[PDB]
Amino acid sequence: SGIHVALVTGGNKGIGLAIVRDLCRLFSGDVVLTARDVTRGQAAVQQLQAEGLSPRFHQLDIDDLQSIRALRDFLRKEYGGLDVLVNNAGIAFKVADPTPFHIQAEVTMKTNFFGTRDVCTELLPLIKPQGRVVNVSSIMSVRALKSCSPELQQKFRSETITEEELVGLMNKFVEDTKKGVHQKEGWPSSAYGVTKIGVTVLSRIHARKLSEQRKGDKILLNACCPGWVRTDMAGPKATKSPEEGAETPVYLALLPPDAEGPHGQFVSEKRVEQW
Ligand SMILES: NC(=O)c1ccc[n+]([C@@H]2O[C@H](COP(=O)([O-])OP(=O)(O)OC[C@H]3O[C@@H](n4cnc5c(N)ncnc54)[C@H](OP(=O)(O)O)[C@@H]3O)[C@@H](O)[C@H]2O)c1
Numbered sequence: 001s002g003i004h005v006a007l008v009t010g011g012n013k014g015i016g017l018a019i020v021r022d023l024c025r026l027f028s029g030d031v032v033l034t035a036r037d038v039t040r041g042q043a044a045v046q047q048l049q050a051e052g053l054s055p056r057f058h059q060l061d062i063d064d065l066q067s068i069r070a071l072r073d074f075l076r077k078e079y080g081g082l083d084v085l086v087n088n089a090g091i092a093f094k095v096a097d098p099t100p101f102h103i104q105a106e107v108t109m110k111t112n113f114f115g116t117r118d119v120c121t122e123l124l125p126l127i128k129p130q131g132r133v134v135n136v137s138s139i140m141s142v143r144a145l146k147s148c149s150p151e152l153q154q155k156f157r158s159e160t161i162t163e164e165e166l167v168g169l170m171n172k173f174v175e176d177t178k179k180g181v182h183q184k185e186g187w188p189s190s191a192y193g194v195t196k197i198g199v200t201v202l203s204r205i206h207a208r209k210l211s212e213q214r215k216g217d218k219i220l221l222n223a224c225c226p227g228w229v230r231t232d233m234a235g236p237k238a239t240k241s242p243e244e245g246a247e248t249p250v251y252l253a254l255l256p257p258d259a260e261g262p263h264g265q266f267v268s269e270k271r272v273e274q275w
């Protein structure tokens, strides 16, 4: 059939850029680097061109629904869909940030959970058979899960939870921080960690829906942690290079055709972790 296409969100720097670079070399088709800032995105494309690579570019800010929709329309028009989607874009307040916690919660949740969700709402319908979806979560999601109340752990581990139930819970965390009741209500103290619970559970729900609604289509969807990577997020003391951080996401993006799994798993260092 037609030309295959892979796309990475937050592709202008850090792990996203390393993922783009690797897909340029390893993905059999076009690779679209996306970035919210057009200047930074184009600069990244130029960087890869100087390395001998040929990524395409399209603007994308996962917090602007019009930007997501424009990208959706582009993919439909130019490719008739999408083969690989890497939801890499994410943010985190610094450990030392004095920003009031409730603002940290609202802002981090807005991008990491709601932005990622919005991208999936518009782009999952475009995924072609044998496609792969990779959601970059964090081992912090596993850590944060342990600090939730037993009641919340049960909900987050549920095999029957719906996307709309999860949306309610994520917004509940944010609202609870605003009311000064998040601890009493069973939430952990890491806003970032809770947003990544959101990403992990969203992955589990979307994998279920793919298996239930698109049987036979051979689509695999997983959450992952890239490990601790030297980027503008984690800082210079981290143990992995962006190259090393890209290995697990690229692995999940390029699972060979007809492969049975992993599917709906949380993967770290190419290995399935218990949720
Ligand atoms: N140790 C680690 O570094 C580590 C570990 C586990 C998980 N992660 C996860 O790995 C992913 C990549 O992080 P990183 O370490 O590479 O961080 P980074 O260097 O800060 O890069 C983050 C990328 O996401 C983009 N982004 C942020 N908000 C966006 C938005 N609203 N719309 C579109 N793009 C947006 C950023 O664009 P700008 O350049 O415009 O800001 C940048 O391209 C994140 O999801 C992070 O949570 C990182």
Ligand SMILES: CC(C)(C)n1nc(-c2cccc(O)c2)c2c(N)ncnc21
Pocket (backbone or CB within 6 Å): 021, 022, 025, 026, 243
């Ligand atoms: C073997 C892969 C495809 C992973 N790879 N990686 C790299 C590579 C090497 C150093 C840094 C980097 O980001 C990527 C590479 C290269 N330069 N030439 C040919 N193949 C390369």
Ligand SMILES: CC(C)(C)n1nc(-c2cccc(O)c2)c2c(N)ncnc21
Pocket (backbone or CB within 6 Å): 092, 137, 138, 139, 140, 225, 226, 227, 228, 229, 233, 234
């Ligand atoms: C700060 C420590 C070293 C605890 N850290 N931070 C992170 C980390 C840093 C930035 C983002 C993230 O999701 C996690 C991390 C990791 N992924 N794996 C192991 N250790 C990690």
Ligand SMILES: N[C@@H](CCC(=O)N[C@@H](CS)C(=O)NCC(=O)O)C(=O)O
Pocket (backbone or CB within 6 Å): 092, 093, 094, 095, 096, 104, 108, 140, 189, 190, 191, 192, 193, 233, 234, 235
């Ligand atoms: N108070 C924040 C802490 C978030 C956090 O742990 N940030 C880490 C990455 S996940 C970070 O920015 N580390 C680098 C640094 O602080 O220099 C929250 O609750 O979300």
